[PDB]
Design a protein around this ligand. Structure first.
Ligand SMILES: Nc1nc(=O)n([C@H]2CS[C@@H](COP(=O)(O)OP(=O)(O)OP(=O)(O)O)O2)cc1F
Ligand SMILES: [Mg+2]
Ligand SMILES: [Mg+2]
Lengths: 554, 403
DNA sequence: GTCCCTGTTCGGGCGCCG
DNA sequence: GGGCGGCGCCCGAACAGGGACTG
């Protein structure tokens, strides 16, 4: 049937006209499928034969449905989509099984011919014109236009989702205690009723949908667990993902690596310890999606790790609102973090990974704070509740960090977990100059035109040193001078620089950097007992800085 | 009543801003409020054919059971076509009442309603978003006080006649009331203004004291003996401060540093250097010359975290020409929340900026974008929302304004 | 202003769902 | 084999902004 719901008014973008695009040849198999679909849709008023005086056309095609012997009729509406008005998408996110609470009785319903049961704006129907070619000599081929929502139009998803919400509103208002998760036309219906009063409510809901033109065929009416829903298996007290099948390809292209990383990221929602760092780094410079890439031995090892992880069986549990949410975070190297969200010690609600590299220079406390933020937002999305944290960092480390840091930073209620590798600050700059340490006035200068430079230091004990560099910059010369001073100093050193750049970098206590030079500096700083970093205005005649400025600027 | 046609700024399209995740309590309060609002005709459900959207959340006063809906209209306000009691800053006490409900008494121009669209989300995305648009003057829209100004003047004429010593000013949803009465006489007068408001259909930040807001001056250290490091830090501070105070000289203090000395060496100040330090201490007491408020420019507000619950801030319009410099303190070091303190600071600074100039500033926040956007809404208590941006400040500017 | 360096946004692949 | 919308990750390309520089 077709829903008696009022249509959604849609207009073309100002100054635009409907599409005029010739139909491309199609297989006789696909043409037979299209004629079988179209004569049935035309008998039911979902499409109407147009004749002349319809100047528009868009190419159509068909593909086999997901897991059926049925055909899906698609239209390549890309030109019309270019020329159609803008919509505001109402699908704000994707429901997650970990957000489901335990229910007495559960049903899953799929709506039949979902799009084709919702009317389309009568004024807009002209631009949806299409043609079937009917490859035979004896059959001419028929032109149709859509009276319902087409598959391939930009506006069909939002219109269908809003219309389904409209249709479900009365049933929800009459049945507040019955829960209906509504993905596009999938309906998950849970209730605290016994099986038998649940089934009568489900029949009332099916009658409600049928009165609004939406059928719920029995072939997709799931009545007993496990329920197949949103790519998951929902058992009574545990859930899981339908099996992940990683590509076992031998040689790997960019597309193969993207598919591998996507499958691993999808699997990481319930599989702990998934890492995609080296596999993703494999994608850096490649200028085409078809290029073959030799795998790094690091990438091969990481992939084998992920494989062995995926071999194990794992489930998730459902949400209990009367308990606390607990997130626990573990660290791997290379800026990778895994997390588990649960309420009872060894019963995960879900798991996840955070690996974003933010900033040219950072440390593990920054990354841990970013992971806490990410998990907070995700758990607000899924549960509307902020979780309580278990982090591998000591209260002393955190208080030191947010004492020394100049930015505002904070983490919610948390508890130290003694599972290594712990998160720690790897060095702390002194707050006052250290007595007895040698004082290094450092500087660097670079010829902006020829890109040659010098980096050097002058010490208060008489030592002076200048190093010439090529293909360098001012900032690089300053960093190189600080590195030189770290190299030639004892376990305790005072350093005076004129560089806000290098000072701001080193003050933030980084332990990892995408710059090899900063990495060398970090190693030096970790090897030192005490370091004090003072700043002075450049080119002001401040003693010490003036001597190095005169030496480095030959 | 008939509406007032409102247009957008020419060449500008409406706001298209994604709704952000809300907590369970906020979503439930929003559903209650919007249900009771659409039952009264103030808003109407819309669909996806409306291409505009602005985010929505909800706040809840401390020791209160009533939630207040807050629409982030910063973009729409920034795109709406355009349409101050200098004594208010000089009053003894000022109380801030929420008169936004009054705006619901006036219809909104029908051709403009599509621009006020907003979307309520759901926990775990159980349903798509529920979309609404306003039929009346929405709270937090810059046009709401302008369209309503005539009715407000008509309401407040007799109260002003019977109380010419009381200064009452209107910001977006807020009514500020200033008087020189005693703290009890003042509180009884506002109760007269609340009852006066209730008698016309307009239903009515605890208590301000603008004469106690203080300027934080730049200050130099006093010492009995100075090291090379001390003189270097002093010279850096004075070199930076000369951009605000042109009279500051550094030559004499800098002469003490000639040569390559160790940081912890003790340097005795010459009489010339002592004279320079004295005159610089004096120059730091004079206020800044040539700082005039431009109403057509935007107010910039910089904030710096000084540590132990101490924060410095500067309101200016062009760099180094500060309109105001101040500090905000709090209980330090027990269970402080840096983000909560930062939001309290931005609210107090915005309050001062509205009271003084009647305009909110644009905030340069010393915080990461993600941390702020994760937590700032749990501590917000104002009905306006200032525009802001996030900056990775240098530690040098922290050292400059430090105490 | 230019050069350098750094952060943010937005688009394009892939994954998953319908 | 391809058409649509949503969310996720991850990468790069544009663009913006602040600091240091030449004569
Ligand atoms: N690839 C797809 N593109 C789509 O636009 N959809 C949209 C249009 S149909 C709707 C729901 O899809 P579904 O698989 O239930 O197909 P329907 O024809 O609606 O229903 P039935 O096959 O009768 O169960 O989602 C689905 C797809 F799988
Ligand atoms: Mg279906
Ligand atoms: Mg230099």
């Amino acid at each position: 049937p077709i829903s008696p719901i009022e249509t959604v008014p849609v207009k073309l973008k100002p100054g635009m006209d409907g599409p005029k695009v010739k139909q491309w040849p199609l297989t006789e198999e696909k043409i037979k499928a299209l004629v079988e679909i179209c004569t049935e849709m035309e008998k039911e008023g979902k499409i109407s034969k147009i004749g002349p005086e319809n100047p528009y056309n868009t190419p159509v095609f068909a593909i086999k449905k997901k897991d059926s012997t049925k055909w899906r009729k698609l239209v390549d509406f890309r030109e019309l989509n270019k020329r159609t008005q803008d919509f505001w998408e109402v699908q704000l996110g994707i429901p997650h099984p970990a957000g489901l609470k335990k229910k007495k009785s559960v049903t899953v319903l799929d709506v039949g011919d979902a799009y084709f049961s919702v009317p389309l704006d009568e004024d807009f129907r002209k631009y949806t014109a299409f043609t079937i070619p009917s490859i035979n000599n004896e059959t001419p081929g028929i032109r149709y236009q859509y009276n319902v929502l087409p598959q391939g139009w930009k506006g069909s998803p939002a219109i269908f989702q809003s219309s389904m919400t409209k249709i479900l509103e009365p049933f929800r208002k009459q049945n507040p205690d019955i829960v209906i998760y509504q993905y596009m036309d999938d309906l998950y219906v849970g209730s605290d009723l016994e099986i038998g009063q649940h089934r009568t409510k489900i029949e009332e809901l099916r009658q409600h949908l049928l009165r609004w033109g939406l059928t719920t065929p029995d072939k997709k009416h799931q009545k007993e667990p496990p329920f197949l829903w949103m790519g998951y298996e929902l058992h009574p007290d545990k859930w899981t993902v339908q099996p992940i099948v990683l590509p076992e390809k031998d040689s790997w292209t960019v597309n193969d690596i993207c598919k591998l990383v996507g499958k691993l990221n999808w699997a990481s929602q319930i599989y702990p310890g998934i890492k995609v760092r080296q596999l993703s780094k494999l994608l850096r410079g490649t200028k085409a999606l078809t290029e073959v890439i030799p795998l790094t031995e690091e990438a091969e090892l990481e992939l084998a790790e992920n494989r062995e992880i995926l071999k194990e069986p794992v489930h998730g549990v459902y949400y209990d609102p009367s308990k606390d949410l607990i997130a626990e975070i573990q660290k791997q190297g290379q800026g990778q973090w895994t997390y588990q969200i649960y309420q009872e010690p060894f019963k995960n609600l879900k798991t996840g990974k955070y690996a974003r590299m933010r900033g040219a220079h950072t440390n593990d406390v920054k990354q841990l704070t970013e992971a806490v933020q990410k998990i907070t937002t995700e758990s607000i999305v899924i549960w509307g509740k902020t979780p309580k944290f278990k982090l591998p960092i000591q209260k002393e480390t955190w208080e030191t960090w947010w004492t020394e840091y100049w930015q505002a930073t904070w983490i919610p209620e948390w508890e130290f977990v003694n599972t290594p590798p712990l998160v720690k600050l790897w060095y702390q700059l002194e707050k006052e100059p250290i007595v007895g340490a040698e004082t290094f006035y450092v500087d660097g200068a670079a010829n902006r035109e020829t890109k040659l430079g010098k980096a050097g230091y002058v010490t208060n004990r008489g030592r002076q040193k200048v190093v010439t560099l090529t293909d360098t910059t001012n900032q690089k010369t300053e960093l190189q001078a600080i590195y030189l001073a770290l190299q030639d100093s004892g376990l305790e050193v005072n350093i005076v620089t004129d560089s806000q750049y290098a000072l701001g970098i080193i003050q933030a206590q980084p332990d990892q950097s995408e710059s090899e030079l900063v990495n060398q500096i970090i190693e030096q700083l970790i090897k030192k007992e005490k370091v004090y970093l003072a700043w002075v205005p450049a080119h002001k005649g401040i003693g010490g800085n003036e001597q190095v400025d005169k030496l480095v600027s030959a | 009543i008939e509406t007032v046609p409102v247009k957008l700024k020419p060449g500008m399209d409406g706001p298209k801003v994604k709704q952000w995740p809300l907590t369970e309590e906020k979503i439930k309060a929003l559903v209650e409020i919007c249900t009771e609002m659409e039952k009264e005709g103030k808003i109407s459900k819309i669909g996806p054919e409306n291409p505009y959207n602005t985010p929505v959340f909800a706040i809840k006063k401390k020791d209160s059971t009533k939630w207040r809906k807050l629409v982030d209209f910063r973009e729409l306000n920034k795109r709406t076509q355009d349409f101050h009691p200098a004594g208010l800053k000089k009053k003894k006490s000022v109380t801030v009442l929420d008169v936004g409900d009054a705006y619901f008494s006036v219809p909104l121009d029908e051709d403009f309603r599509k621009y006020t669209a907003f979307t309520i989300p759901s926990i775990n995305n159980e349903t798509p978003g529920i979309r609404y648009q306003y039929n009346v003057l929405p709270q937090g829209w810059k046009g709401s006080p302008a369209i309503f100004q005539s009715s407000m003047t008509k309401i407040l004429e007799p109260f002003r006649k019977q109380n010419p010593d009381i200064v009452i000013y209107q910001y977006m949803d807020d009514l500020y009331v200033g008087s020189d009465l005693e703290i009890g006489q003042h509180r009884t007068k506002i109760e007269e203004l609340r009852q006066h408001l209730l008698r016309w259909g307009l239903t009515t930040g605890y208590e301000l004291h603008p004469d106690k807001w203080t300027v934080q001056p730049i200050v130099l250290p006093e010492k009995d003996s100075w090291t090379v490091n001390d003189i270097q830090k002093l010279v850096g501070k004075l070199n930076w401060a000369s951009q605000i105070y042109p009279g500051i000289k550094v030559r004499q203090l800098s002469k003490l540093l000639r040569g390559t000395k160790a940081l912890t060496e003790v340097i005795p100040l010459t009489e010339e250097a002592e004279l320079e330090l004295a005159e610089n201490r004096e120059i730091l007491k004079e206020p800044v010359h040539g700082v005039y408020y431009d109403p057509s420019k935007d107010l910039i507000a910089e904030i710096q975290k000084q540590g132990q619950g101490q924060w410095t801030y500067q309101i200016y319009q062009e760099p180094f020409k500060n309109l105001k410099t101040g500090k905000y303190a709090r209980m330090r070091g027990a269970h402080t929340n840096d983000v909560k303190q930062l939001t309290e600071a931005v609210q107090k600074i915005t309050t001062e900026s509205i009271v003084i100039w009647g305009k909110t500033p644009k905030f340069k926040l010393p915080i990461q974008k993600e941390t702020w956007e994760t937590w700032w809404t749990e501590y917000w208590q104002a009905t306006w929302i200032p525009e802001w941006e996030f900056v990775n400040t240098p530690p040098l500017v922290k050292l400059w304004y430090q105490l």
